[PDB]
């Protein structure tokens, strides 16, 4: 019942209830004549919502907000982008125009600036060192160290045991490394181990793209990263 590319018109968003007061959002985007799904997180914060990641661009992001307004009907007051690439910050202006406070680490803000990407307004302090964790309302934010990118964060919802790995975690179907231009291949397995050691109790693991699963997505990503490392 998890939405895939074939059930999502490009420009539309679906929401998927993972657990109580936790949803993934699913959008699609064309890239290089391919069509990819993309996940984000929505977490109930009392009477308001915390959004994790944009829906990969302004049009998708406006559809996401409209879809939240329709299906949940609670206001999105804050949003966190998990790394500086366009699939996570693309649409930050749309959120901002709708009165959402947008957040990212100084690391992510710096890299987005350098990249010429949209720049979330507010800064998340205390994530600069590997293994750093900080509370952000109904979630914990964790910097495991460099993986898909030097700045990538993961999000844990303690109340629901939902780990959102963002693009540092691959779904099981993805058997080869994705787009690794900005990755730290050498540090990626160690960063996944930090996630393993810090959240052994996670029941649900949501990858940045594709199907959710359990904690084996961590070991899976390790396996894939290592196979890529050994390309010859
Ligand atoms: F099977 C697959 C293969 C690759 C992906 C990733 S599609 C690329 C998304 N992306 C991007 C991106 C940003 C802007 C334009 C294109 C890709 N930056 N970081 C990441 S992750 C997903 C599923
Ligand atoms: Zn990326
Ligand atoms: Zn503000
Ligand atoms: Zn991604």
Cα(201) to ligand 4 centroid in Å equals: 24
Rg of the Cα trace of the chain? 16
Strands (E), the chain: 14-19, 22-31, 34-45, 48-52, 76-80, 101-104, 122-123, 132-136, 139-143, 154-157, 162-166, 204-207
* Structural biology method used: X-ray
Residue closest via CA to ligand 1's atom 19 equals 85
Ligand 1 first shell, C-beta below 6 A: 31, 36, 85-87, 167, 174, 178-179, 208-209
CA of residue 47 to ligand 3 center, whole Å: 18
| Per-residue tokens: 139 | 């979630």
Closest CA to 82 of 215, 206, 212, 214: 206
Other CB atoms closer than 10 Å to residue 116's CB: what's the count? 8
Task: Please count the structural domains in the chain.
Answer: 1
Q: How far is the CA of 177 from the centre of ligand 1 (A)?
A: 11
Return the active site residues.
83, 85, 87, 148, 179
**What is the span of the domain harbouring residue 177?**
1-232
Say whether 25 counts as a known binding-site residue: no
* Strand duo 132-136 + 122-123: pairing: unpaired
Is 182 marked within a binding site? no
């Amino acid at each position: 019942e998890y939405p895939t590319v074939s059930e999502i018109p490009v420009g539309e968003v679906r929401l998927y209830q993972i657990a109580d007061g936790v949803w993934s959002h699913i959008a699609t985007q064309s890239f290089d004549g391919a069509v990819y799904p993309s996940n984000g997180l929505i977490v109930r914060d009392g009477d308001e919502l915390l959004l994790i990641d944009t829906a990969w661009g302004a049009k998708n992001t406006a559809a996401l907000l409209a879809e939240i307004e329709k299906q949940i009907g609670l206001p999105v007051t804050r949003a966190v982008s998990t790394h500086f690439h366009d699939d996570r910050v693309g649409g930050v202006d749309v959120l901002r125009a709708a009165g959402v406070a947008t957040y990212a680490s100084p690391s992510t803000r710096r890299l987005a600036e350098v990249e010429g990407n949209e720049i979330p307004t507010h800064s998340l302090e205390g994530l600069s060192s590997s293994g750093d964790a900080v509370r952000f309302g109904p979630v914990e934010l964790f910097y495991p160290g460099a993986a898909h990118s030097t700045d990538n964060l993961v999000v844990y919802v303690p109340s629901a045991s939902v780990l959102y790995g963002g693009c540092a975690i691959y779904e099981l179907s993805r058997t080869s490394a994705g787009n690794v231009a900005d990755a730290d291949l050498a540090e990626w397995p160690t960063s996944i181990e930090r996630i393993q050691q810090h959240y052994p109790e996670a029941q649900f693991v949501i990858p940045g793209h594709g199907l959710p699963g359990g904690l084996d997505l961590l070991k899976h990503t390790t396996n894939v990263v290592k196979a890529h490392t050994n390309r010859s």
